[PDB]
Structure 1
């Protein structure tokens, strides 16, 4: 078997976004370069609304 758990099922995706979301869901099965944690933001602006 090439993978213990497949990265994603190709028959379920419909666009590029679906692949990205599926890859994030199955990333726990793979050996990760950096294990995700809470993100840290150094840049934030709020624009005026309607």
Structure 2
């Protein structure tokens, strides 16, 4: 078997967002270069609203 857990089922996805989300869900079952944690923001601006 190539994979212990498949990265995703090819039939379930319908667009690129779906495959990105499936990768983000399944990444815990693979060796990760950087284990995810809280993200840190350095630049953030709010535009004026209607």
Query: What TM bracket, shorter-length normalisation?
Result: over 0.9
- Consecutive unaligned residues in structure 1, runs of 5 or more: none
Q: Whose helix fraction is larger, Structure 1's or Structure 2's? A: 2
Deviation at 1:49, TM superposition (A): 0.5
- Consecutive unaligned residues in structure 2, runs of 5 or more: none
Partner of 1:37: 37
State the alpha-carbon separation in 2 of the partners of residues 22 and 8 from structure 1: 6
**TM-score, normalising length: structure 1:** 0.99
Deviating runs (4+, > 6 A) in structure 1? none
Tell me how many residue pairs correspond in the alignment: 50
RMSD value over aligned CA atoms?
0.3
**TM-score, normalising length: structure 2:** 0.99
